[PDB]
């Protein structure tokens, strides 16, 4: 570890502040880090919380290095500053976040049809590469706008994503909490320590119901009561006794027809057991997408976007 190697590396390196106007105009704040709009001297520049590299940063870097897909976010470059020992990532800018669409409408059917189809194919591709997202929220789904590609939802912010190819330790021994309680699957909420890949299916079903009713289906034992209320109690894994019809009426209250094609898929997406839950590939085979309107690559399909651009903080 000598001076000449350091000076040569510094000469080879390029400074992030010397190339991008990341200062100011912060566009997103969260527990993952800070997201800014940046341009060369538009991209989303993300600074990760915490000095040095943490488990989230290491997983992020080791996962999006080798994953490539039209429906999956892809970083273009990474910067590593030694003065303060923190990490900077550079994704392509995604103007519209699904949370913004949900909030603005509080709605074409083909739009939600295509959006669900695209998220299902993306999560199927993710499951193909033998990895678990372990976090699906409406704020983690981003939509391109008025660019070279329209629509084309992108899954991102997979800091909690972990490979499940072969577990050296149980998946719950190093992460008691994997996702927010609004979308926690019943299996892990019942204290399961080894959970399969079906949790993401439950999450996508929950968010699909949220877009169907334009209102959070699950709102706040804090969520177990709501889970039992929304779709009844299972009368047909651990702490079974320690815990101490409704779905149809709940969907009817939101002016959704009980007898339709979307309702059957939504009902079959959410089950109390992992074995009977459908996997990603069978979701596309559901003739729900087949019925008109057929899913589109462009969600807007030529319509003007009424949602405003993301605002600064």
């Amino acid at each position: 570890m000598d001076y000449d190697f350091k000076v040569k590396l510094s000469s080879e390196r390029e400074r992030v502040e010397d190339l991008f106007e990341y200062e100011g105009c912060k566009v997103g704040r969260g527990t993952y880090g800070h997201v800014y709009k940046a341009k060369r001297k538009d991209y989303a520049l993300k600074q990760i919380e915490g000095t040095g590299i943490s488990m989230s940063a290491c997983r992020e870097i080791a996962l999006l290095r080798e994953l490539k897909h039209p429906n999956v976010i892809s970083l273009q470059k990474v910067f590593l500053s030694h003065a303060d020992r923190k990490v900077w990532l550079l994704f392509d800018y995604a103007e519209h976040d699904l949370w913004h669409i949900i909030k603005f409408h509080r709605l074409p059917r083909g739009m939600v049809k295509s959006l669900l189809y695209q998220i299902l194919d993306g999560i199927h591709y993710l499951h193909a590469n033998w990895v678990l997202h372990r976090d699906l929220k409406p704020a983690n789904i981003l939509v391109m706008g008025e660019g070279p590609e329209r629509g084309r939802v992108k899954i991102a912010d997979m800091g909690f994503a972990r490979l499940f190819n072969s577990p050296l330790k149980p998946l719950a021994d190093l992460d008691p909490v994997v996702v927010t309680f609004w979308y926690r699957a019943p299996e892990l909420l019942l204290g399961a320590r080894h959970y399969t890949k079906a949790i993401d299916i439950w999450a996508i079903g929950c968010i699909f119901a949220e877009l169907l009713t334009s209102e959070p289906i699950f709102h706040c034992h804090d969520q177990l009561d709501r889970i039992f209320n929304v779709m009844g109690f299972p009368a047909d894994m651990p702490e079974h006794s320690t815990l101490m019809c409704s779905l149809i009426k709940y969907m009817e209250k939101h002016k959704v027809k009980p007898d339709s094609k979307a309702f059957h898929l939504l009902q079959k997406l959410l089950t109390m057991d992992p074995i009977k839950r459908i996997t990603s590939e069978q979701a596309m085979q559901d003739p729900y997408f087949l019925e008109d309107p057929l899913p589109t690559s462009d969600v807007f399909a030529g319509c003007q976007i009424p949602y405003p651009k993301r605002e600064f903080l």
Binding site: R193, P238, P274
Partner: protein
């Protein structure tokens, strides 16, 4: 990366095995089943080799001539079969 050859689309031993190192999504693997003990005690992982998996033995004798003769026999028989 044109110089390197890829066996991605060439199955190895087609009757019993598929692509050499590409791993499809098997529907009957050990990472999807949920037994009563698997949920409670977590994933049960046991060492691939009983005893010392880390340990590597080099004190056992090797005969390079015998190995070379066997490999020559294998390649000659494969040429004869094809």
């Amino acid at each position: 990366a044109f110089g390197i050859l890829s066996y991605e689309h060439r199955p190895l031993k087609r009757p019993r095995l598929g692509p050499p190192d590409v791993y499809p999504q098997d529907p009957k693997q050990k990472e999807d089943e949920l037994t009563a003990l698997n949920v409670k005690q977590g994933f049960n992982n046991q060492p691939a080799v009983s005893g010392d998996e880390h340990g590597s033995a080099k004190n056992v004798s090797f005969n390079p001539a015998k190995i070379s003769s066997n490999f020559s026999s294998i390649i000659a028989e494969k040429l004869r079969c094809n």
